[PDB]
Every structure is written in C-alpha cells, then in structure tokens.
Amino acid sequence: ALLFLPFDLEVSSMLPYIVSIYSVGIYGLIIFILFLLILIVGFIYEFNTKSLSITTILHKKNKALVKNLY
Amino acid sequence: QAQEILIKANKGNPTGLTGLFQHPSPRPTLITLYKATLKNLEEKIPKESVYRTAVEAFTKERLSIVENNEIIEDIEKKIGSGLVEELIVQANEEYDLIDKMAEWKAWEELEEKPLDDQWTYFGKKL
Amino acid sequence: EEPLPVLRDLPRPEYGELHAPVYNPAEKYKEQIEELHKFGRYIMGCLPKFVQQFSVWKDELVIYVAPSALTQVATFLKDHTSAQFKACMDVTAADYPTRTNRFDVVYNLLSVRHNSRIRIKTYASEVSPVPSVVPLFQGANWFERETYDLFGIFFEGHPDLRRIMTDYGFQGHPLRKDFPTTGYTEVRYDAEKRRVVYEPLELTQAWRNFTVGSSVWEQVGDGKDFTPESFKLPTPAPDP
Amino acid sequence: PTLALTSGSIQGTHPEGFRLPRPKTWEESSESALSKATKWYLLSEIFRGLYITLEMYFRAPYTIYYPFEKGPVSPRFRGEHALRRYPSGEERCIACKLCEAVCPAQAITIEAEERIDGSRRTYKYDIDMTKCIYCGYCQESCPVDAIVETPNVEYATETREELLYNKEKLLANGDKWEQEIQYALDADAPYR
Amino acid sequence: SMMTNEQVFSLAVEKLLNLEVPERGQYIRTLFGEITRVLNHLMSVLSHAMDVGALTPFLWGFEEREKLMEFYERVSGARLHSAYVRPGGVSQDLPAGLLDDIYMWATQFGDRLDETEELLTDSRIWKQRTIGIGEVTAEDALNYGLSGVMLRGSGVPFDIRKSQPYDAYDKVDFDIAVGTKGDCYDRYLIRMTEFRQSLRIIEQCCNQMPPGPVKVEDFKVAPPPRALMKEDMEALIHHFLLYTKGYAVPAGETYTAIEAPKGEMAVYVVSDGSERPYRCKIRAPGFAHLGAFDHIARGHFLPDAVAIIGTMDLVFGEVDR
Amino acid sequence: ATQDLPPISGYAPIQWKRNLPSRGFRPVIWFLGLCTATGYGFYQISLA
Amino acid sequence: FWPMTFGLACCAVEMMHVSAPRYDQDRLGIIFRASPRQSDIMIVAGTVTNKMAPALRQVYDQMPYPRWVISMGSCANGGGYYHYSYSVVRGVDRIVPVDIYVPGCPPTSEALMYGVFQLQKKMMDGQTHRMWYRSY
Amino acid sequence: TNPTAFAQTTRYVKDSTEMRTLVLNLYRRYLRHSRGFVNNYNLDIPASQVRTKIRQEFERQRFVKDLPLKNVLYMKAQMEFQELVNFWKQQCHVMQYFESIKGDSFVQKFLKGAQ
Amino acid sequence: SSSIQRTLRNLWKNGFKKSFKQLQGYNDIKSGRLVGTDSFGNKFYEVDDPVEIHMRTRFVEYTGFWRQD
Amino acid sequence: TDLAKELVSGAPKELITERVARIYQETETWKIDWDILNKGNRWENDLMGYQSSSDYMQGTILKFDTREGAIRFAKGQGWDYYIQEP
Amino acid sequence: SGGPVPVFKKYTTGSKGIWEKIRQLLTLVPNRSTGNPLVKNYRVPPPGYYDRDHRRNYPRLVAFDQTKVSGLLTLGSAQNPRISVGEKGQKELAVFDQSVSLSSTLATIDPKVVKSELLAEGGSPVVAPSLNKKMKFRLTEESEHGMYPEDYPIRIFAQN
C-alpha cells in the first residue's frame, strides 16, 4: 500500500508526455525512456527484496526427528 | 559417545506419503538402531519376559535382512512393514518402547485386580 | 446411428425355487476367531501387569484394563511393531449403575498397517480420575470432551476439557441412565424480558411408556459355543 | 511360514512402485518456454471454461412450472394421512392400536371402547402432524389398511392448531382422497 | 447420505442377531450404497466449489441429485429420509422398471462429471485456491483419526469397503484414488475419481442383480407379506408381535464400521437381550475431521478456512446427533 | 417376471472414464496470430 | 421474496433443491440473502435446539420490517422426531411469531413452494395504507 | 493443536492443602474479572453485586469434606470461568443467572393444591 | 423448449384469449390436448409436442385469472 | 460409598429433598421408579385431550441386576427411597 | 472399459438434421449428451424352523482371564493336550479354580512351551491379525484406469 504512492506518481508523471509526444520529438522520447529506466530500478529492487509479499506472522517449518543414541 | 541419528527427514524427495521424506542414509541407520535395540534389551528387561523374547526374534531377522541386502525394494519386500523411511520410524518407536517397558516393569504381577461385579453385564459374568 | 432400444421390451429370465442358502453366519468368522485369540493371548503375555483379561467375539478383540493401566496398554498398542494401532477411532462410555464403577470407557483403535482393529475397555466412577490418551492420540481430544459432557468422567491430563454438545452452562450429564430423556428445563421467549429464558419442564403430552410390554419370557436361548479347540481346557483321560 | 518372523504382514507390504519417482526439474519439461507462456498469458484453459458454459446457454433448461406442472410421484409416496372406509361406508379401523405402538414419534393417540351397535370402534384418533416424521410405519402396521398416507403435500396452514388432526379431520381426508389412495394401493399391491 | 447411515445400523443389528441378508438384498444395498455415495459427493464437491466461488457447477449437479432422488422416492416413497435399509434386508422390493431408469441415467452421467471437471480441474484459479491448502501429513492423518478421503489424500491407501467388506462390495470391481500431497486439491481429485468409481459399481450391480428375497426369510425379524398375513394365523401373530414388541436381540456389543461417503462411520451398539438397544454410540467421520480443523487451518487465511471446511464434507447433524 | 432383473444379454456398456480431449490450435499458432495482429494493427495506426 | 439463509438440518436440503434448476425459485423473484438486513422472510428449516434458540431470536430481531417467518418441517413446527429431547425446542413458535407452517419430514420442494405461495397470497391481501385511512 | 484462551490442564489433586490454594487462586480470578463480566454481558448491576454473587457460590461449597468431590467441583468451576471470560455464554444466560430469587403455610398450599 | 418458434407455434394454436391467460399465471405459452375437467373446474391438458422436456408433458389451466392455488 | 455424588451430578435438588424413589423386584431385575406427584402427575389438555405432565421423572425406570446395586446407587445419589419387599 | 460412447447411444434428447451438424461443428466435445432425459423412452410406464433358527444359535460371549490363560500354558489345550490322567488329571486342573497369576506362571515354565503356544512360528511375535487377508493393492497406469494422467498428484490402486 505504501509503495502504491511512488508508482501512482510515476504513472501521473506520464500525462504531460501523452499529449506532447509529437512536439518533443526524439529528444522527449529519450527523456521519457530515461524517466522510466530510473524507475525500473525500483521495480528490480522490489522483486529482489520480495517486498510485495504478504507479511504473515506464523511460519510453518518442518522439524527433523533425531535420536541421540548411546 | 554422541551417536546423533536421523530418524525422520524434513527435506528431499517425496516418498508418496505426505510429510514423509526420503531418508538419505537408510541402511546404516537401521543397523545402528537395530543393534542398539538388542543391547538395550539385554540391559533393561529380564529374560523371563515374553516381550523381550518376541522383540529379539524379529529385531534380529529384520537386522539380518538389512545386513544381507543392498536393494531397498528387496529389503521392503522381505519385511513387509512399509518403506524404509517407515521402517526407521518403527525401529525408533520400538526402542522407546523398551525404555518405558523397563520403567513400567510390565512383566510382573497384575497390579490392580477388577472388582467382582466389574466385568458383569446384565447378570452374566464375563 | 441406430435407434436406442426399448430396454423395457428386452427379454428377462424366469426363476422358480428360490429361498436361501441355509448356513450359519457365525462360521465365516472361525478363522478370525482363532487368530484374535492368539493375538489377545500375546498381549496378555507381553503385559501381565496390566491386562486383566481379554475377550474375542467373532472378529472383535477386547482387552480389559484398569484405569491405572490405560496409558501403558495404549502406548504398547501404539508403538509395538506387531501392533501398530496408530489411530484411535472412537472413545465412548456406557452407564451401568448396578456396578460399583458405573461407566465403561471404551477405546476402539485401528491399525492401517496390519488391517486390524482392537478394543480397550476400562472402568470409571463419577469421581474417579481416568488417564487421558490425548498425549498418545490427538484424535481423542474431542471424544473425551464428548464423553465428559454426556457422562461426567474425569479425564486427567486433558489439555482442554469442557462441554462440547450441551448448551452453555448446562446442568446434568444426559447419557447417564438416571438423567430423564426430556431433561428438566425448557426455553421460551419472554415478551416482558425481551429474551429467551429457561423454565421448568412442562409437556402438553407426556411421554408414553409402551416399553412395559417387555416379554414375560426370554426370547434368545443360551446360544452355541464357538470357542477354538486350541483354547479349551483339556479333559483328563479315563482310568487305565 | 508367514512374515511373522520379522513382525511383518501381507497387508504391510506396499505394492511395486509405491515410492514416488524423482520430481522433475525445470529442464525436464515437455513444452517450450513460449508454449507455456502462451497458454499462461492468453488464458487458454479459462477461455475453454467459458466456451463450455456458453454451450449450456443453448440447451433446454430443466425447470418445470409449479404449480401448473408437477414433479413425478410414485405409489409408495408418503404424504398427508387419512383414515379409510370399506365400500359399504364402515370404517376400516378396528381400534387395534398397532399404529400407536409402532409410531416412532408417538404422534398417534387412540382411545377406544365398544360402539353402541357393539362394534370395536374408536372414538378418538389423533395424529399430531407437527410431531409425525412421515415415515409410513403406521401404514405398514395396519392389518385392515385403515391408516394411509395420501400423495398430498400441499396442506400448509396459517396456524399450528390446524396440524392437530382428529378423527373427524382424518376421516374427511379419507373420503376426499379415496380415489387417489386407490391408485397407489393398486399399483403398489404386488410389492406389499 | 441417508441410506448409508441406515446400512451401518442395519449391519450392526444383523451381526448381533447372527443373521445375514439374502443375495438380492445385499446387491440392493450396494446399488443404493453407491447411488447414495454419488448423492453425497454431488452435495459435497459442488457446495465446496460454490463456497470457493464456482456457482455454476452447483446448479448443474443438483439436477443430477433430482434424478437420483427420484430413484429414492420410487423404492421407498421419500425423496430424502427413506427408511428403506432395515436389519434383515430392505423394506420393499424394487418396483418394475427401476433398473432401466437407473441404467438410462448412468449412460449420461459421465458427461455431467466431465462438464464439471471442465470448470474446476484444470482451472488455474481453482488450483490456486486448493493446492497447498490444508496439507495433512500421513502421520497426523492417522493420529487425529481422519478416514476416507482425508486419510487417502495423505498417501494412505485404506478403504473400509476393501478392509472389511460387506454387502456385495466383494462381488464388484472398483479402484481407490490416493493422493500424494494431502491438500484440498488432492482430495478434490480423489472425490472426482470416486464419482467415476461409483458409476462403475452402479453399472455392475444393474447387470448382476440376482433374483430372490430381499429381506431375511424370518418372520420374527422381518414383516410377512400382507396376502400371507391375512390368511395364515402364524403370519398374523408375527405381524402383531413385530409391531407391538419388536424383536429381541441377544445380549452383547459390537463396533461395526462402513465406508461412508464422509469417511469411516461406525456404531457402537450394546444389547441387553431386550427389544431396545442399551447403548448406541455413533462414530461420525465429520466429528473427527472437525476436531483436527485447528491443527490444519493454522497459518492459513480466512478465505482458506472456507476451503478447509468444504473439503472435510461436514454435515453437522452427523457431527452433533 | 415378478422382479426387476437385468436383460438376458445384459445392458450395453456405459462411459465412465474421463473424456476431456484437448481442443484448439498449438500455442505457437496463437502467439503468431497475436504478433500478426499486433503488426497489422500498428501498420494501420501508422497509416492514420 | 428474499428469504434469509437459515438452513439448520435435513430440511435445508429441500430448501436448496428449490433453488435447483428443476424448480428454480429465482424465476419467481426469490433470492436468498446472507444478512438479515437484506431479508424479509425467515425460513426455519431444521431443528431448533436450546443452544441455538437465543441466536435464532437475535437473528430474527435484526430483520427490518416488514418481516415474515416460515416454519418448515416437523422439527420447526413442533419438535418432530426430537420432541421428547432434553435439548430441542418443541416448535419454533415458542421463540418467534410464525406466519405459515409447512408440514413434512422433510416437506418436498413443491410442499415448500406451496407454502411460499400461501404467504404471497396473504401478502397480496395486505391493506396497510387503507388501514390508516379507514381504521385510524 | 493449541488450547483455547484461559484453559487449564485437568489434574487430579491429591493434597487438601494444595487444593485449598488452587481454590483461593481461582476465587481471586473471578473477582478480578467481575468488571469484565459486567462489560461483556451488559449487566444491569454493578460489579460489586457480581462479586457478592461469586462469594455466595464459593460459600455454598465451603464445608465440602471429601477430596474427590473437591476436584470435580474445582474442575467444573474452572470450566465455568473459561466459559464466562471467553464470552461463550450468550447474554441471556448470564442475565438469567442473576434473576435467581417466604414459603407459604400448610393451609395456603392446601388451598392452591400444594406441591 | 426455450425457442421462440415453439412459443409462436403455441400462440397460434391457443388464440389470444387463452394465451394471454397463460401470459398472466403460467409465465409460458403452451398448448395441448384437452384430457378432462375436474369437479372444481380446472382443465387438464397433455402435450404431444416433441420438443417438450420430460416432466412438462402435463399441465393444468386454473379457473382463476390472477391467483392459482 | 458415603460421597455426596449428588453435589456433582447436576440433577436438581428436588430429587433429594422432595421426590421419593421406590426399589422393587417386579421378576428377575430390580427397578427404581419415582412415586407420582400428588398434583401435576397428569392433567387433561383442553385442546386435544392429551395427557399433560410436569413430572420429568415419570418415564424414568432404572434397572439393576442385584438388590445390593439398587440400594447402593440410591444412597450414592442421596435419594429418599423405600424398598418394596417381594 | 468405460471409453467414450457416441451421443446417439445415450438416453437423452439430441439434435436433428442441419442442427446436429451445427452442434458437431461448435461443440468442443461433440459426443457429450445434453442431459435432458428422453420423453419417449425414460419413465414412459409410470410407477402407478430350528434348522434355520440362526439367531438363537448365536456365539456365546466367553472371556479369558489370567487364570484360564495360565491353564493353557501349563495343562495344554483340548486340541493339543499336555495333561495327566485320572485323579492326577483332576488334581492339576483344580489348581486353576482360583486366582493364578500368569506372570508367576511365565516365571517357571519351559520356553519350548511358551514359544509354541504364547508365541508362534518358533518364537516369532504374534502380529495383529488382518480383517481381510485378500486386501491387496497395485499401482496402475492411465491406459488401465482411464483417470488423470501421471502429472496429476493422485494415483489409482487396483485389486492386485
């Protein structure tokens, strides 16, 4: 929910480019890609950190039964 | 002496029974458990017991199959008591049963006799 | 593409003399009877300190134990490889007020390994503690709660013993022979109190006791013995 | 010689191949990466389920229009109770109290005496329809076929009092439903 | 699963009575034993699916229940509570033309199962709701007393119809599906296989139904025919005595189990030699399954509790009784 | 004659094994059509 | 006609078959609602026990008016098979007012539909607004 | 599995001194949770009246001598406590518990049919 | 059984007056052969239409127009 | 033996304070039933003539295999009882 | 086996003429029936002593306490006698008319006797007897059982 806000602002930042794509030409297109490439590092970061999972409080772990024989 | 022995594994391939994983060292473990059982019998339970006599009869023959067979399927087919992972659990539980039986002294006289009317149902005594 | 047949018009066979195969159903359990006699005798030999006696009827074997022997015998029947009775299918009780110890706490165990069933019988009274087999069989947790709820049997060591069938704050143990089948109280909605309240029982039509037509004669006879010859006592020979 | 020497059993032996084989890895699949991704991204099995559902849209529905149409009934059907008469108009019940004793719910109450003409007849025959379990034991136990259950089911009432059938109500049902009762008895005659 | 419940009580009383149902009676209890099993799995599988969110399969299969309950009503006269299986056999014989209707229904029921599997079996949403949900180890299944599909989903191949056969289940052929992962998806597949295995048994019973009496030839237990009752004095006495005193059962006790559609259903009956049972403890498979819910549902989320409840096949009349 | 019995020849066998045969094109074809449609679509967008 | 989902026992199976395709109550405008707030009909289909009676009354009290109650089956009508039980209410009309009683063990789906049709007939005879004009 | 909240394992006490301490500890728990009972069950009486009612029930079994009866009484008193705190009892049952309460003469009973 | 060809076919057989009555209580326009009439006045019909499904070959016409019991 | 098992049975106090039981051998078993209420044992229902009752022990009949069992059980419950000598 | 069956061999109502060809064109599995029962075939005919007194020959409930069990190990059984004769025979059996502990009996007796009666197969432990010795299973394959292929997480067991 917190990470929704940074990505929502990123989506809202593309609105100026939508209606000016022709005027900015290739210069604006390259800048638009650079805007998205810097934000794609955040996407890589969230994938590798697994930050978009569900924070359970219980964890099911399989204990091994062992015998301290004599 | 620290004979740390794996009884149940918590990782590996599935055996076909949920929650029971493949034991990585089947044969060496069964030998160690079987032999420690026979020694534990001679040290805790008197020779007059019928439980001690019966356990040694099948512990040796189960041990005599693992000592003379390398194919896991052949060992299972000659005992007929589940997989070897299952056979290890059975051997572990039998070892723990000797400790309790020796503690209980189950071979002695009946501790608590029933009352006269106890096992009588509708007048016909059982 | 052929038309479906009218299965009503297909021919049927005709049959005449048909009554029954005349045979005694108890005979088919003969092999089971002998094997359970040997297995019960094995358990008595392994636990002479705890097994009072055993009984075999058809294909059912019963082991009679004291309250102070239930945990041992249940543990033996759970862990011994010859008898891997891992599952406790049912725990229940029956009321016999004529006895010093009213109740018969009964444990039915199942062994999926050997495809075998065994029964454990122990006794109890209204105040005598009974060991809990919940540590051994976690499936006995609710069955012991039901047994207490409807009989009032003190299961010592039960992790959470409480009512499971009757209403909250219910007085009495319904399955006792002295508990009347209609209970003592009934509920209704009280308009002045705006809530459902308990009141002493009154019945528009009292329960009718047709049971008084119990036969003045006995119907079943003394029966036929099926004890294996391997378990009957030998008879002394005649004089030389 | 059994497996009792090793504490084994015939039932204890697992069949050949009981142990699960080795689980597969990622390289040991039969479909290419693009094949599995096309079924995944384009929702192959989801679209198939929609198509199966759309087939039902063009089939005949099962609905019947109650109360203008009725579901099938059999001569053994258990419904509303009714006391029966002989063709002469005399009641079949001899106040024998068989149905009262059988009744699993104790829904039948009978009081009997000697009629003025001298016949063994009842003056009180009540069935509590809010207590009956519509089980047919009274019908099976009657030795003169006096008590029956008609195929009627549509007798819902505003008040619970109307479900306290007395002898006059039960006899009125037998007169009302006698023809329909005749259908069921004639058809179910061979099996009784 | 009405008729299966009557069968376990009938079997226990017949065992105490030392009687046995004739050949045709046993087949009828097997035929409607598997019709009843299908009736139960239609209620269980489709209600479980409906609780997950699949509304449509519930509607399709309930029409199959209507066709099956028509067979219930034709033999007994009640769509649901057919006191048809009784100690000694069945209350009444099969009406004329019943088997042809059963066989006609069976010719189409395979398509009904396939169409149901079209919406559930390979659906990714259905598997996400059931795979890895409510896992039960083979050890914990035995310790908690789980039976039937709950036990079989955990890898244990145990069925009461095979372990202690009864009433012509030894004279038919069927296979038991066994799971390997012990979760909700494994038990769904097992209950779908049992759908097809019951249909396999239904076809065999229709082709192997023998002639002869359906109830035991003993008027001290079973009612005599009405035509004989009204001409024979001894028949009228037995009819009079059966309905006014019942029949005495020799003193003793029994624990008789069957493979009910929910699992192992058993009755512990105690006889005091009289015409009334001294004690009757009913072992309910759903009672044991619900006693393991806390062990199974821990960790899972609230929507997963809905799946775990539906995969146990909990009818609370059986649980509470 | 007085009991419901199977016919002398018995009933015809029924279908009970699973019958859900696969249907549709290979996944390669569906992917190609998607790329073919995307290519033609952007061609028309480019023309407009 | 929006009943509340209150199936207690085997009488609920027949209530589920009314929604089944053969009878399809939905064609008559009958929809089952989970919450008492969206319901105006309470169909008591099953045995009412002493442990359940306060919960049943509370659930009934939360229905906004106008509300009607249908009592289905012998258990709800008068106790039925369990009339002489220590833990059974001998009729749901000891706890809530009942507008119609449907008999049977269980009542068939047609028997329940007939009971609903009787209630709809009584609902069509209501004169609430003419009661204000002519009786108040 | 895990036990429910406020659950105690059942144990048969064989010492009257140890039994007396367990009873006194439980009696304190009833008093401490008295204000909770008024809150959850929406009672129309102060918590002071609830504590008085608790003492009366403990005073009824003040002079029970037999040890086996003490254990069953103690076990049942623990079950009731676990029932009240966890809000398993419905509010109607707790309200009626406080609804509980001069005998007529011979003639007075004779006139109305007596008991 | 759900097609408009069946409905228009039955609409032509019954006529407007009879079909409008079925459009008010029956919810379905249906035709059949008159089989009888009971002592209360209900008219009972049987359908020979091959597209009618299993349990719908017999139906009743009630005397009333707004309520049917 | 002397334990007041009525304290933990759950039965109401009237079985101990008001009601009186009878122990009798009716012809091979010993039974225990309760003496009827002076009033409230039966009364005719005005609606359908049913036999109403407020006696909840009216249908309860305990069975015992010996005379000793019947007396021992009655004492254990603190019941007021009289033995009907055969 | 229960392989696929053509739709016309099922007692349901199908399509005719041009509409059957269309149905076969637009159905994923065209051999599936519609499920509507045939009107002209389904339900067209509407439904409208002592020699055999086995109950009284029921097995008698017999119990075996430690006293009688001890007698079998000491005196043998009626099928395998090990008892003396005459007045000596009745002296030995009357020993087991009162309480005789089995654990005491197990103390002083030849193991050759214990391993022959108490145990079995020469000292082998007694195993829990099976309720049905015919219960066997075997894994099968999809070409046999017709159920889900191997990739599904269930398996089918036959009678073997």
Ligand SMILES: CCCCCCCCCCCC(=O)OC[C@H](COP(=O)(O)OCC[N+](C)(C)C)OC(=O)CCCCCCCCCCC
């Ligand atoms: C045209 C626009 C509408 C449809 C667009 C999307 C359709 C599905 C695309 C992915 C298919 C895929 O991935 O194909 C994979 C699979 C089959 O392949 P397999 O499992 O290897 O087959 C096994 C081997 N065979 C090739 C010999 C069979 O195909 C399908 O299941 C096709 C299902 C389509 C039937 C329903 C059509 C109508 C759907 C509803 C439309 C509103």
Ligand code: SF4
């Ligand atoms: S059908 Fe059964 S419950 Fe109803 S009145 Fe007859 S015997 Fe009694």
Ligand code: SF4
């Ligand atoms: S069984 Fe028949 S004849 Fe006897 S009392 Fe009942 S209705 Fe009358």
Ligand code: SF4
């Ligand atoms: S009335 Fe009959 S069908 Fe309805 S809930 Fe009660 S027992 Fe079940």
